[PDB]
Symmetry: C5
Subunit: 273 residues, 5 copies
């Protein structure tokens, strides 16, 4: 049938269908997703006053991101269950058109919140040295936006037009690398002046940042990571994608936020850990 | 098909239908909408005590507006997905009558909250000089109400009666210009007596106000901005409208509120931003 | 069609149906309704500590009422959209039986919360002189209950039995007049001892009270206010009713609560307006 | 129709059906139910600091109970509307199987929270004299549990097996009487040492306790209180049941909690009424 | 019918169906489940400042766990969606359009709960010989593996008894390790502290041991009376969800309460 510019999940769901395990796991992992976010929201709110006032905006922004992430992940969980329906006769879940096609694009647009805020918030914990606050912020926000928008466009074509898929992806990747560049600079400048304990944490933050953010373009490519008609162009690929997103989200948002708060505590004059 | 006094989205949806991208993007952008608002709610609550007590009503009113905006944008997101349903055979989303017709009128009525409050709240940060508090407030609230109500009437006719559409629109525009007038006065009087830092922020606030508020009549006209049977009288026009609304909403509510809070901080005796 | 003891909305919906504007406006105005209430909830919570401790129960009760009002108005909004469904062929919304008949009775029973609390709460701001606190409270609560319950019974018969409609209404009206009586007494005793500023506010409160509360029996009668087979026995009447309710609710609950809080501030030794 | 071990509501709904008034009132009263609970939640949270720290657990437990009650009453409201559907032809609501059968059992199991907590909480306001805290608590909790569980079993048979109905009921009643016994003891010991104002309140609390708690076994029996084929074995009986539950719930939870808080205030060294 | 790798609830629901009592009780007990969790959330938040600042992370983590609400709520809805009344025979049968019922929701949400529940005690007790990071890491790794292996197993609880039991066994191994470490922790926690505190830690260990053990009980539940036994039936379905609910309340709420009580005794102010 005629699906057009639609994510590959829909093509699997429309042809092969999803096994119990495939469908259920995807449902489960998305649910875990939004559960983590709302739990995180509570954590970040409840820990605000555990750091000096100047650092507390970081906590607040963590919270802001959690709200966004919860809402989107919740929506997406529902979208998954609405989009695919059990067929008694063969014992598989198939595309149910009246539920809408499943799209990952929900995620992408909500990054327009998450990415800017996640990048922003570290600038409230670390002091810069050579770099200007406004400069770093602006470069983060611009590169962040362009990364997301270009990617957002790409992913519509992940089946219908492999070329546009890869080209927009490439453009997106460029802006990604810039963000990586700037974050490294920031982290290095942040290390200057501060205790070895704080430096250790920033080291961890950078590792976490690097891995977790890289997962996202991984999820982009996931269906094609074993070439055409590979292992991953299948329900297994579908599962892998949503797993990676969920891991990425938890890491890039919650764990990131926790580490930052820990850093804030070491840099806090009153407070110990 | 007989649609009557209904928004043009429904006419597109009933005849041509919406592509995957058109339907999905509109869904996505509305979702981002309400997500931003709930995130904002948390921000404004959590930052109340970042300014002197006298300023804190501004924070509170920001929060009040966020609640309104969230609820409306959430409803509207749902209305969009209910109103248009996938057709397997042609691969487009078509008007589903049993979901109700899509109307933008939800937005308009909720402005009866937002507009009065957004105008009101600045009067808790800036001091007036030559203008009287109650006078400015009353002119804001009256002109605000009339602007919205006249617009609300107009938009019902955006297809069924181009003339009424444009006339009510024109009347609405008059009240808009008055509001612009008064806000300018307010901004200028607010600048007097206060630090250059604060003056800079009020300058930004005015620009933001001017652009963001102007977008709304833009969205009004959107379908017709390329004349009859133009580019924009189409799913592309539908997309444009909801994008512009979302940008307008984020700008006019969240960013506006942030800047005001920043101003409040500079004007705060204790706090040194 | 066999509807029985049902509100007149259902008879309109079942015979003539509702135009786009009629259906949509009613939907919109009910939505505004509950949006205002949740916004109000936030306001009243966030402003508690803006008055002396002794006054703060008034804020708390405002909040309590908002919760009630939100829940009910939300339910009612949903009930409206569920009860009436678009017919493609004629382009009007008709009674959809599977959604339940629309009833205003939801509102009535929730007044069993709102009315007692709204009457109660003023007694925490004003001092009485000659009257006893418990006496005024008991008279409010008894008369309030009887007013609502008798009205609640009446409105079931607003179509099926004009006689019972008017008789129960009349009985209800009696208790209403008593409440008006007592509130006047309270307002007068409240004015004694206190600044001209406070007296002004109580004057406004009384006007607001008188008008807003009177709207409710107006809504009761609405369908018949232009006699049999009049303008108002129609979708226009339906619209009028729900508009009036929404205006009444906002006025009698939110604005009322705001004014009371303003009064509390003037009567607060520490706090200024 | 084959209904089995089902509540009598379903038998009425399946045979006679429910009139507009019967269906609507039941819907309305259940809605009022959960509305009161959520309002109560807000009240109890907002008033925590109105008593000395030692008393504040009582407030907290009130809040705990409200959350439980809200959730259950909300669910139950939805269950009612899902279980019974309008039939255009005769103008009555009939059992809709696809909505599930209506069961009161939701209520019963949620008492496993409410009852233990309601009994517990008074022990944080009153001082015992002869009786030990842990002893009273344990007897409350055991007797409470057994009361509920035995009742829960009974009510499944309220139609299918009048004998089991009455026997399990009887067993339940035994545990009830014990609870009554212990609460009386507690109330009497609580009166010793404390002001006449406090004693008055505890007297009221005992009356409230006795009446409100007794309503619950009343609701149990309701359908049969006028014998076989009586007034009450009918939609009128259905209405009566849910009314009584709602009155019982408001009384046993909210009003009870309010009185306790009032008592706490009199017993507070810092605070006056 | 063709159900595949699906939980046994679905096989009961598809063949025999569920009586009013079976269906309703399961609905009721799951509802109680999530109600308790939301109530608990409020309790733990409202009691944070009842202990010294250093202990307050334990309260916060209790709150975080009260995850449980969201999952139990979802699961309640899943139950009612998955099984629909048949008027003709008066039983509830599998309704395919609602999805098959899976317990897997629970399992994956443990990936939150278990790590946090294990973690949080380390904010109340002082260790002696053991290192904080060491205990944490062993908890978190063993916790994850326990859940993941179990999660895989339960898919096969009907379709493949062998895989069911094998993955279960592997899971059990990691469980025993967690038990081991928790015991160590409890013992080290007792050292140096008041008799009041020691008493509470004793209770905590008992509660931990019983409540956590219930979970593998629920795993096996359908087969605890052998093939075609009492429990391979709607009665078994009921038993499972009851045990989960008891386990959840115990392992989360009561656990959290006791910990807070311990925190209070150890509090100087
Ligand atoms: C909390 C959400 C976060 C941190 C999202 C991050 C998203 C990215 C780093 C996306 C990167 C992409 C590319 C670099 C290429 C493909 C398109 C994107 C947007 C997925
Ligand atoms: C947060 C919402 C805001 C700030 C809404 C603002 C809305 C307007 C400025 C609407 C203006 C209009 C005209 C000036 C002409 C067409 C009708 C309106 C109401 C869209
Ligand atoms: C917040 C809700 C309020 C203040 C509701 C007030 C309701 C009334 C004053 C109702 C009055 C009525 C009559 C006096 C006659 C008709 C029946 C009633 C109940 C609508
Ligand atoms: C907030 C809920 C409360 C206070 C519930 C109280 C419930 C009872 C006192 C139930 C009593 C029963 C009997 C004594 C006999 C019939 C079975 C019961 C459980 C309804
Ligand atoms: C709050 C949730 C908790 C404490 C969950 C605990 C879960 C377990 C201890 C699960 C244990 C299992 C086995 C040891 C064997 C079968 C598979 C599991 C995961 C159910
Ligand atoms: C229905 C589920 C609700 C999720 C809870 C959302 C968390 C927001 C509330 C946290 C507020 C914490 C207040 C701190 C008080 C400290 C004592
Ligand atoms: C969609 C592109 C991302 C832009 C993020 C917008 C965030 C709005 C807040 C801006 C307010 C200015 C902050 C002043 C810096 C101190
Ligand atoms: C199939 C060949 C590709 C045609 C469209 C490519 C679009 C690339 C956008 C840059
Ligand atoms: C098409 C490549 C876009 C350039 C990426 C580098 C970003 C520059 C921002 C400074
Ligand atoms: C699946 C395993 C669960 C891991 C839980 C991750 C939670 C984030 C922890 C951040 C590390 C903080 C360490 C500080 C110790 C004091
Ligand atoms: C010192 C200035 C701090 C500004 C913090 C801004 C936080 C605002 C949170 C609102 C939600 C995110 C807005 C992003 C909009 C992107 C579309
Ligand atoms: C379900 C999503 C809930 C998001 C709503 C946010 C509610 C605001 C809570 C504010 C808590 C303030 C406490 C401040 C403590 C420092
Ligand atoms: C300090 C001034 C006194 C406060 C008055 C309280 C009124 C608050 C309610 C806001 C009303 C906004 C006006 C909107 C008009 C809608 C008419 C239709
Ligand atoms: C001076 C009171 C408000 C004036 C209205 C501005 C012009 C209205 C246009 C019609
Ligand atoms: C159409 C009704 C619009 C009102 C919606 C607002 C709901 C929240 C209440 C806002 C209160 C205004 C604040 C007035 C402050 C007065 C001085 C203190
Ligand atoms: C200064 C901190 C005071 C915290 C008060 C927060 C109260 C928030 C409750 C209102 C609910 C907002 C709507 C949430 C949408 C879901
Ligand atoms: C005190 C009693 C209330 C008096 C109000 C008038 C009662 C009308 C009764 C109708 C018969
Ligand atoms: C100091 C005494 C104040 C008592 C106010 C009680 C407020 C309880 C709020 C719940 C609403 C109850 C309505 C029952 C009908
Ligand atoms: C002193 C300020 C403390 C703030 C307490 C806020 C309590 C929130 C209670 C939750 C109920 C919110 C209503 C539900 C909205 C949907
Ligand atoms: C069915 C009985 C319900 C009991 C409520 C469970 C509450 C757990 C409390 C643990 C014991 C704490 C002892 C301190 C007093
Ligand atoms: C204690 C057990 C009570 C069960 C009695 C059931 C009697 C059934 C007779 C028909
Ligand atoms: C019909 C309205 C019933 C309202 C119930 C509210 C219960 C409060 C009773 C306590 C009275 C306190 C008196 C002032 C302190
Ligand atoms: C059926 C089990 C019900 C358990 C209670 C549910 C509510 C959770 C809140 C816990 C409150 C217990 C506090 C005890 C205080 C000890 C000091
Ligand atoms: C819509 C129903 C939501 C139920 C509300 C439960 C939320 C619990 C969190 C409230 C936090 C209150 C903290 C206030 C501290 C004083
Ligand atoms: C996959 C599981 C993820 C768990 C999500 C729960 C979110 C809560 C975050 C846990 C916080 C860990 C506490 C860090 C301790 C450091 C503080 C020392 C002072
Ligand atoms: Na599905
Ligand atoms: Na749709
Ligand atoms: Na509708
Ligand atoms: Na119904
Ligand atoms: Na069902």
């Amino acid at each position: 049938q005629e699906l057009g510019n639609a994510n590959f999940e829909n093509f699997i769901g429309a042809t092969e269908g999803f096994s119990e395990i495939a469908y259920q796991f995807t449902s489960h992992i998305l649910t875990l997703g939004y559960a983590v976010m709302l739990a995180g929201l509570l954590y970040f709110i409840l820990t605000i006053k555990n750091v000096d006032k100047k650092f507390q905006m970081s906590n607040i922004l963590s919270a802001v991101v959690m709200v966004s992430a919860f809402l989107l992940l919740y929506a997406q969980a529902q979208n998954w269950t609405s989009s695919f329906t059990f067929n008694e006769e063969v014992g598989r879940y198939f595309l149910d058109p009246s539920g809408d096609l499943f799209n990952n694009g929900y995620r992408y647009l909500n990054w327009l919140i998450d990415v800017p805020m996640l990048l922003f918030q570290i600038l409230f914990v670390v002091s810069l040295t050579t770099s200007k606050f406004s400069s770093v912020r602006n470069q983060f926000w611009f590169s962040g936006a362009m990364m997301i928008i270009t990617g957002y466009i790409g992913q519509f074509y992940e089946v219908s037009n492999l070329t546009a898929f890869l080209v927009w992806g490439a453009i997106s990747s460029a802006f990604f690398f810039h963000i990586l560049w700037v974050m490294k600079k920031v982290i290095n400048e942040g290390k200057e002046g501060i205790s070895p304990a704080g430096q250790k944490i920033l080291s961890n933050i950078w590792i976490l940042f690097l891995i977790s953010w890289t997962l996202y373009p991984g999820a982009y490519l996931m269906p094609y990571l074993t070439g055409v008609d590979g292992f991953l162009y299948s329900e297994d690929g579908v599962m892998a994608r949503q797993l990676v997103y969920t891991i990425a989200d938890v890491s890039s948002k919650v764990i990131y936020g926790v580490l930052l708060g820990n850093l804030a505590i070491t840099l806090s004059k009153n407070k110990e850990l």
